[PDB]
Every structure is written in C-alpha cells, then in structure tokens.
Design a protein around this nucleic acid. Structure first.
Length: 187
DNA sequence: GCTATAAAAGGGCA
DNA sequence: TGCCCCTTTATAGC
C-alpha cells in the first residue's frame, strides 16, 4: 500500500466513472434503436439512445448531436475502453463516428475508516461545509472546497467521495477528511 | 423502493 | 434562466 500517496493507509475504491466523447458525426437515433440490439429509445421521455454492453459493464447515452455519455465503469481506462466499443458499434451501423475529446467527467469512490462517527458533532463544528438532516437522509453531506469534492459520511464510518475528474482528487479529499473524522469517533 | 451526491447530455416547459 | 427528463454508483434509514 502506497502510504506516500495514501498516508492514512486506506485507499478508496473506485465505484463509478462518468465520461464523455464526441463522435463529431451526426446520428440517426431512431435507426440506431432498430439495428443495435441491447439498445432502448423513447424520444418523448428522453432524447437519447440508451445502450449497454457487458464488458466493461457500462451504459451509454447516445445523442443525435453525436455526443455520448458513458457511465458505470470501474476505472478511467475501463471507461475509455467502453466508450471506444460503443463508438465502434456506431461505426458498424454506417455512421462515420470518431473518438474526439474523450474526457473523464466524474469519479465516484468509497471507503471505510473502520470506526463509528458522531455525525452531529461533525456538522456542528463544520457548519459551513456540512449539511446533516437525518430525517431526510442518514448521511452527512460534506462539501469540501479544496479540492472541490463532496463526501457523504455515515455513522457506520463508510464514506462516499464524488465529483472528482482525476482520481488524485478522490484520494486527496479522503486524506483531508480522515483526521477530521478521527476527531469525531463514537464511543 | 424512496430520501441524497457528483457529472455529462437534449428536448420540453413555464 | 432554471429544472426534470434521463444513466451510473457507493452509502443507509425511512
């Protein structure tokens, strides 16, 4: 375990990657929904072809403008491999799709500090960063400014870390919050 | 299943 | 302008 990059000794696990790419070419969404297989389309509910592949396990949102959203991957590279596979499926349907401006847009991670947390005390002493309303949602919402990352912190000690575009931002946010969480361990 | 969080995308609607 | 449509994923108490 690289304690130079993770002084806490804990490495958050990447759970979800959102990326975007531009095929540059215009698409016929209705025709794609007829020819492609694992593909749904209902334009009066949403203006995109929803397509899924098995490996990497992802879901694509494909728009008539040529833009594509890839969701569900476990790593930045699985997200790119998936986006290329969808773009290849689009190319085998008669469309001159390209792979322009691929970009990681969101990285979701999670981890466990292995001790309970007094969420109320954390919200009290960090009122400017925290939103905690247990009657609405059992997790405390921590809006970290540097880096700009949102953390969902639970009594169990599990944490959700979302909003990063580089994984180092996921790790840095967790390393910033870890000594704060230790200050609010529950008996 | 709701409740909450981030992000991208487009049509539809006050 | 602002928002939900819509997709993903962890987390957990209604």
């Amino acid at each position: 375990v690289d304690l130079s990059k993770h002084p806490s000794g804990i490495v958050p696990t990447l759970q979800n990657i959102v990326s975007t790419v531009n095929l540059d070419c215009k698409l016929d969404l209705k025709a794609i929904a007829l020819q492609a297989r694992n593909a749904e389309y209902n334009p009066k509910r949403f203006a995109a072809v929803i397509m899924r592949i098995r490996e990497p396990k992802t879901t694509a949102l494909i728009f008539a403008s040529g833009k594509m959203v890839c969701t569900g991957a476990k790593s930045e590279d699985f997200s790119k491999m998936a986006a290329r596979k969808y773009a290849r499926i689009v190319q085998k349907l008669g469309f001159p799709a390209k792979f322009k401006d691929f970009k990681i847009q969101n990285i979701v991670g999670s981890c466990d500090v292995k001790f309970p947390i007094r969420l109320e005390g954390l919200a009290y002493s960090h009122a400017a960063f925290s939103s905690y309303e247990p009657e609405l949602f059992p997790g405390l919402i921590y809006r970290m400014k540097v880096p700009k990352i949102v953390l969902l912190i639970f009594v169990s000690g599990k944490i959700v870390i979302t909003g990063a575009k580089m994984r180092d931002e996921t790790y840095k946010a967790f390393e910033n919050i870890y000594p704060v969480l230790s200050e609010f361990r529950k008996i």
